[PDB]
Amino acid sequence: SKGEELFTGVVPILVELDGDVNGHKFSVSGEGEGDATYGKLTLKFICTTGKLPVPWPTLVTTFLQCFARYPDHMKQHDFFKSAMPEGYVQERTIFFKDDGNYKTRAEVKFEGDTLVNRIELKGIDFKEDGNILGHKLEYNYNSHNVYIMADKQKNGIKVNGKIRHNIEDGSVQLADHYQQNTPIGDGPVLLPDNHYLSYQSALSKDPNEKRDHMVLLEFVTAAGITLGM
């Protein structure tokens, strides 16, 4: 398909985000590449406006599900590639249990041979010494599944995952991500049966890097539709 041959290989990625959380402003610029063939994703992010006012792991989901490896029997349930290269708009809220929420709009689309994710994010009503503004999260990440269902009421999909953020006292901060993907092009797109993406994420630091930054690797495989009985 038009959108499908775009992901036979490695694909350069660019990410740009401008943020407000409780009236502290910041920007993040991201570089890396994706390989939908493996289900791999590799990025380096940098806070260009100084120190990040929130823990890095709280932005991982905000920051490319087109790079998910869909199995053979499920290729016709891949909304994400089907909508390339004109792309999709992602509207989403992340609710942190017993704390504030992130509201963010983003546009994913090809800008040349590069996939570009332009993000806008606002946050309000965060506890000034909660797990987030307190910077109390471990710098790591856990397996999570992301549930996908058709929203043909609007030619799009709805997507929800519950994220587990480990805190330094052995407590867990929960984050509920609800998102809506709606195509930009008017071309026909794939509306999938119910399924999920199996996420694994690993965060690290570049030793040769002076700026507040995060190295993020993700592994994303579509699952949830069996063959036969």
From TrEMBL:
What is its subcellular localisation?
Host membrane; Virion membrane
User: Of which family is this protein a member?
Assistant: Belongs to the vesiculovirus glycoprotein family.
Q: Quote the protein name from its UniProt record.
A: G protein/GFP fusion protein
- List the source organism: Recombinant vesicular stomatitis Indiana virus rVSV-G/GFP
Give the source lineage, highest ranks first.
Viruses, Riboviria, Orthornavirae, Negarnaviricota, Haploviricotina
**First and last residues shown, out of full length:** 514 to 745 of 750
